[PDB]
Subunit: 167 residues, 10 copies
Amino acid sequence: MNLINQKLFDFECDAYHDGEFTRVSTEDILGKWSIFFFYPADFSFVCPTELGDMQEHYAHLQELNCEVYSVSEDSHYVHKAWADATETIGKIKYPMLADPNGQLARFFGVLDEASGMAYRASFIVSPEGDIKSYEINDMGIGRNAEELVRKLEASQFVAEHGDKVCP
Amino acid sequence: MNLINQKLFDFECDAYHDGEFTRVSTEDILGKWSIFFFYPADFSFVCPTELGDMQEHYAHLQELNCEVYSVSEDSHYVHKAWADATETIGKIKYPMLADPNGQLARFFGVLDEASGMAYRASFIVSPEGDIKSYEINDMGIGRNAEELVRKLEASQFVAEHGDKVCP
Amino acid sequence: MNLINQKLFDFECDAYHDGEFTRVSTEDILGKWSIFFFYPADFSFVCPTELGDMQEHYAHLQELNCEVYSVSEDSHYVHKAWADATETIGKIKYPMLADPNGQLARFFGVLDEASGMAYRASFIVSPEGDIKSYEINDMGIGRNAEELVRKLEASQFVAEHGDKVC
Amino acid sequence: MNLINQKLFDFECDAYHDGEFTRVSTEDILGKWSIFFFYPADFSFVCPTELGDMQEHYAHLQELNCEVYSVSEDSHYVHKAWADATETIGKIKYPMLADPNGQLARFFGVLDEASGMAYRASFIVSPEGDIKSYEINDMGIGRNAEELVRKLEASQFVAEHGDKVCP
Amino acid sequence: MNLINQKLFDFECDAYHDGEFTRVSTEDILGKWSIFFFYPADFSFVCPTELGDMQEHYAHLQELNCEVYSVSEDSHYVHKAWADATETIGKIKYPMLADPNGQLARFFGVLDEASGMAYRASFIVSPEGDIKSYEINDMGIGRNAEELVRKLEASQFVAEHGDKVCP
Amino acid sequence: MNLINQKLFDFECDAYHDGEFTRVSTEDILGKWSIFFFYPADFSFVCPTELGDMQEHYAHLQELNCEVYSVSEDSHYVHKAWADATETIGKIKYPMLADPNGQLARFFGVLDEASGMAYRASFIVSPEGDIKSYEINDMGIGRNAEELVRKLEASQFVAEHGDKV
Amino acid sequence: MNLINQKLFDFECDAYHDGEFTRVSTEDILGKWSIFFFYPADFSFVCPTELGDMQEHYAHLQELNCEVYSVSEDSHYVHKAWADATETIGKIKYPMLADPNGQLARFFGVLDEASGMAYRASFIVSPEGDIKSYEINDMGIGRNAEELVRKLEASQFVAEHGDKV
Amino acid sequence: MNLINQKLFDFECDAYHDGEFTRVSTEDILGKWSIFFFYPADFSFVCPTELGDMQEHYAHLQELNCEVYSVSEDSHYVHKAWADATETIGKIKYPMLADPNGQLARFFGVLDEASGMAYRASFIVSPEGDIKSYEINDMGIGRNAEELVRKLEASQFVAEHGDKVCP
Amino acid sequence: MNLINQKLFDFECDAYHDGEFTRVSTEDILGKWSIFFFYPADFSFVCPTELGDMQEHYAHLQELNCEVYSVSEDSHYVHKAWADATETIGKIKYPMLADPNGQLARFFGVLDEASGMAYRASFIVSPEGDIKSYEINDMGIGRNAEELVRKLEASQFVAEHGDKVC
Amino acid sequence: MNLINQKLFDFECDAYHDGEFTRVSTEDILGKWSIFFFYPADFSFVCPTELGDMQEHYAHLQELNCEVYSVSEDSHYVHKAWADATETIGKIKYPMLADPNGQLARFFGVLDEASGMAYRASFIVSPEGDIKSYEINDMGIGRNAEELVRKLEASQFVAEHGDKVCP
């Protein structure tokens, strides 16, 4: 009942990336580290703050050879309008994945079947596609981007050196 | 494999109606005739024209004791923004049902599991909750509101008089 | 649950077509646009007007490269008799499929098991056999032949200009 | 795999009887002897001399307390038109049952699934409902009405004669 | 439920034929037309007029290239003894198949499991082995040998000029 | 699958008994010792010898409070015919049960499915319905009535005498 | 469940045979007529009489090309002990098969699950392995060796003489 | 797989006890401590020193309120004969349970299905019927009666002062 | 697949708590906020710092009406020994649950069957027993006790002001 | 339901052996006699005199070509700490296997699922891998190392002596 050391399934979906639409697949994720950033709904109040704080640390994540994929059950059409409507989302340089069919949310197991929306979940995945650490929060419980960056550095530190030791 | 004379299941969902949110359920539909108007996606190009033409005939449908429920796999949050963004949607006086979990689309059987979006489907339902006639079109094949009004009048004509005859 | 982008199954079928019996199969239907016009029963009062309306629009559908196939649970024998009895049916030029098996009605999912008669349903099908746009009416609710033509014109337009790119 | 001494299932069907449509059920059939006369198709290029032959002896069967029920997969609508077209069926006085849903044909096990038409089958049923003797022929192999009358007369002969019948 | 156009299964069985015992198989039946004449019991208090009546028409059935096969759940020992006891059975020239294991009666669906005896049934079968027409009568309801000949002639003339009646 | 100390199942069947047809049921058999004497077919060569040899010991079996029931897959009509056609069979006084539906043969597990004929099997059964001792022989292997009478006496002796050495 | 004309299954087992232990298998039994003589328990009262009565007819059975195999759920160790403890059992010359695992009793369907003891059952088996004729008796019902010898002679007579009347 | 703290199933069986036959049941075993001493065969060429050795310690086991139950797949007839043949078995005063039906051996899981004999196994059981400790040895691997007594004393002193070692 | 808004199952459990053995059950856990702090193994180098960090924040979590429950697959005997051996563990005031059954690890879905050891996971649970917010780290990736406190503070805030109405 | 003459399944586990961690597998175990010594828990308030008693006789077992493998559900980490804490385990020279995932305990069927701890169980296994004799005790019922040595000595005695052993 956990996804630690589980490979990403084969998938393809629409995305929104720097003012235009693209098609992201499993092949595009391999090679770099990756953070899947699930969130409940577009045109919401709490979500923009979480996405906006992930943008601030996106350059630092880029520096650590890590891509960011924000995921919602909204379509790629809706993401574009959300970027136009709110300046916080317009500042987002990372790719915003669309998941209307729910393949991702169901694979990662973060879909609320009643609401039809993804939980506030985050997943750190290695370049080989293995899930290394993750977090699930219920709606209303906001996240901390700094901690999410720390986990990635911590996991990269263990990936490079086989035998970790305390100071 | 058809829904003629099938009762509506018990359900409850969020809606967008005259600039504010409400909760529509199966009880709210009973008593009047009803047209469920499924469409693929908000912030789209073809959809507004179909919804805008349903608005033009909404007063005439109101006159025939019939409510209109537009359905999409988008959230009620997204419908509000779509009304603000585009004047055609802002003119819509009828309730726009949200179906992110897909309960409606799956019940009526109009969900494309690949796309995660509803087909261009329309359903005419009697006041007792029985499905009387319906239409499913694939994406890109637009609808005609006039024909959809004709079917409702035609079905109401048969509902009132038990033995129909040709001229 | 819906039938969109489902291909026609393999089937053979007896039909009355323009004063003569023939055998239609899936191969004869493929290669050109198809309209499947289901209707409840021969020798009824409400059916003739629908089938007649399609014949008025049939020559136009021939130009649009589309064949019409009327279908009901009656035998082919009954179609010939119905054509001889009434002028409306007698002028029908398109083929009249017979489905006493219910194989078509059941495939299209449009049979009323209680009555053993098909609903007033219309299916638009592409040359590849893919079901593209349809409607299902209860008994008593008639159809509008002009709408079928507009839907076929519309669904053809999309097929030419892939996925509504215009 | 035979129906001897099997009671009729409770059913209801439309019928053309004496220039008018009437519903027939087991209630109506029970209490009197009954012949169920199945045949392939109305408006057949094959001459319906079988139905005519049953009419010739129908008065005989009336006086033996036996009603005749012809059955095919055609509708009651098709029966009426057949009577109006040909004099042979026009003179039919016994009820003509319609079995478009296969209800009766399937119960008796006389439906050819491939053509959707009943075989040339005759069943003699008692007032109590028990099937006493029957006959099943392929399409093209015609029947003899006088033979059916003989079987009825014979089955009645035994029906009365309980005692001193190889007890 | 319906044995029309069903091929004869593979079997062998004992039989009494014109004073001696033989072994009849499915192979021996194919090539000519065949009438399977089932009956309930040898040494029956009910005089076997049915069997004697078939004998009167046997010479005629031979000229129509058809063999007669009487069938009963009695043994072949009993068939011979029954012929030696009564003239009617002593004049029988067609083979009398014994079915103590019930393989024929069960295949044709004519066995009464309670009594362990065959119903008064008659099956007409083609040279290819296809069952073309049949009748099943309750115990005590006699048959008409003439009518079986009529059915065979009808079946044969349809076989001679099949699928070409009224161009 | 030894079938010993299994109770006789509930049934009814037709029989030919001393120039008359009768309906024998389980309740008629119960209350007294019984021997079910299965045989393959009426109007055969070996069967009458065996059945005749049982009739010679029938009066003794009756004195020992035991009834005989001969059983085959032939009907009761055939039993009557075989009785007044053959002298040996006409002399028999015990009930000749018919088993055309094969209920007795199947329950005793003595039916040859190929033939649809019972094997040459003899079953001793107590008054309580309990199957006590039996034999099953192939076709062509004749039986000995004396031996069967001996086995009844042994069964009855054991029934009465408990704690015997 | 009549078991006639069923072939003997493939097995091996221990046995005590004339003052010595042996391993008997199916292949040793095949090629000649055989009688499997089941009995409930060693060191009992009725069993030795029956086994002794078989030894009196063993030389004849041997002349008729038939071997006897007595069988019980007792081990081969117990057979040896019973042989040199009892005079009747010491005199026996045929193989005494042991069936502690119950494979023979279960296959012949002759095991009483309550006791874990075989019934008094005798099975005649042809050289080809085919079970031809048998009897199954309850505990306390003794057998007759003469009758069993007669049934062998009958079985052998039928085997040779085809189309006999 | 593990019989620790499993209650004795309900059973009755024959047994040899000090010159006479008795009937031992589960009821008779409860109330006192119990040792079930399984062994492969009576009249074994392997001298039954194991059984004789248990007898030497029997008087001691009686004073510890424990009964000894030797178990074997041999009958009770054989138990008596084996006692009359050899002094070691003739000096046995504890009951010798016969298990020809294998119910005990199968329950304890000690039967060798191939040979049909019990392994050299010993089970210690409480007055409540709970299996407290046991051993299972292959054929040819002998046992030590002293060590079984040690196990019982250990089990009893734990039972006397249970769940209160080192407060 | 996730465990959000799933109630604690009924269970009993041995624990070492502040220099003494006790028996914790579901009833003792309910009625106040719970943090379940899973960790791989006693007598390891990476675990002490995490458990020690929680003890530093434990008094603050007591004020917030939240109890901490450390869990691993070790026995209760091993927890006492680990407390005696190292000072970091010796100062632990919160109860240390033992899970040699794996009943907790399996319920929380956080056991590594290969190693038979729990992942570095933290579960926040409400007084009603509903799981509210959690995280699952692979072996080797440590945690931040401050974040757990912020999440508990955050999840409590929502619980007071129903469904984020502020 | 017993393990006599069952081969060890192929496995691998961590172990504390002679002041260091080493992996152990069937490869390492095969080729020599083996004793698997299961015990409930490290750091038990119960004195581990059993492990000490095995060490006292370990040199004896070394010279009989037999390695000792102690097993519990504790980790290898816990074994090392137990050796550093108490002198009794500090003197242990034989390998101490760790079974935190229950792999070994479940195979031998000696795991108490309710406590998650192995019973006081001892298994004697041959160089070929076959389990020759074993012992299972409840918690609290202690063992005797000298008895285990005796069983090994006995099982080896038979192992060599193939011929003239009740063949």
